[PDB]
Amino acid sequence: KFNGLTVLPPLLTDEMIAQYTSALLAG
Amino acid sequence: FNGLTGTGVLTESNKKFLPFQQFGRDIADTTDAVRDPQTLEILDITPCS
Amino acid sequence: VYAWNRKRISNCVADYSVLYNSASFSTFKCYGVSPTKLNDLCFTNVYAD
Amino acid sequence: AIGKIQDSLSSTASALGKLQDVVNQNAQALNTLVKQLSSNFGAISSVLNDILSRLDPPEAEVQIDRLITGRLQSLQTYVTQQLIRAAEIRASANLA
Amino acid sequence: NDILSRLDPPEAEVQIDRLITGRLQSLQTYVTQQLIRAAEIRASANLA
Ligand SMILES: *[C@@H]1O[C@H](CO)[C@@H](O)[C@H](O)[C@H]1NC(C)=O
């Protein structure tokens, strides 16, 4: 945690992932 | 603190040290909190931002 | 030699510069710790044989 | 069938083990990287500030060199593990 | 056993450390080779 290790957030978070899946389902 | 050197932010903690416990240790074998050698008080060591 | 004394010392403050400035010592080799960085540290118990 | 799928997903979480194992393996990977800091690797102490506060440089160089060697080798091990698991997840992403 | 029976413990510890260091490097090279070979075998098994 404090030993130099970090977690980078993903470029596409859950909201746009859900939007992509919604677009695929609707199409 | 009694020969234990390090860099961090000293803040007042809510940890319940037992009266015979002089410091706390984290998972990574790093100092997490200490007891002041002059004052019977409990302080947590948080690394700097 | 076989009946070597052991003096346990506690609750004191020692400067250790008396061991430096005295030239009568023909043998002074410290092994596990640097004797020059001693006054800035603190230890649990010290034994003097 | 949609209702049965909903019932199964609400009933058991063991179906999502194909994601749980990856998350857990990442968890023990970072936990390994954390706990390998506690090892001496032949040094007198595993705390770098403790080594610095005790010793003069002519022995501190050797002790810190041992600590660096152990920590770096443990890290390289973590790096290769992350790389091969990234290859696994790459193949999984290709299949998906 | 020859190192332990021949040398004094302060030097025998250094010799043992060197020996186990070389042996653990050999072990981790073997393990990584097994890992990459298992990746190839798993890809072949998925293809099959
Ligand atoms: C340090 O000094 C303060 C003030 O005189 C005193 O209250 C405290 O007990 C001292 N520390 C110890 C360990 O005795």
Angstrom distance (rounded) from CA E12 to CA B1: 38
- In degrees and rounded to multiples of 5, residue D61 shows phi and psi of -60, -45
**From the list D53, D56, D59, which residue is nearest C41 (CB)?**
D53
Helix, strand, coil percentages, rounded to 5, for chain E: 90, 0, 10
- Chain C residues with beta carbon closer than 8 angstroms to that of B35: none
Q: What ranges make up the beta strands (E) of C1-49?
A: 7-9, 46-48
H or E segment to which residue D12 belongs: none
Q: Are A3 and D30 within 8 A, CB to CB?
A: no
Burial class of residue D33 (count of CB atoms within 10 Å of its CB; 0-12, 13-18, 19+): buried
- What resolution does the deposited structure have, in angstroms? 4.0
User: Do B34 and B43 form a contact (C-beta atoms < 8 A)?
Assistant: yes
**Any bridge partners for residue B42, and if so which?**
B35
Residue type, C9: I
**Any bridge partners for residue B23, and if so which?**
B34
Query: Which two structure tokens, joined as six digits, stand for E21?
Result: 């260091």
Question: Determined by which method?
Answer: cryo-EM
Using alpha carbons, select from B17, B20, B25, B24 the residue that is nearest to residue B41.
B17
Using alpha carbons, select from B41, B47, B49, B35 the residue that is nearest to residue B6.
B47
C-alpha atoms less than 13 angstroms from C-alpha of C22 in its C-beta half-sphere: 9
Residue type, D83: L
- Chain B residues with beta carbon closer than 8 angstroms to that of C43: 3
- In degrees and rounded to multiples of 5, residue B11 shows phi and psi of -125, 155
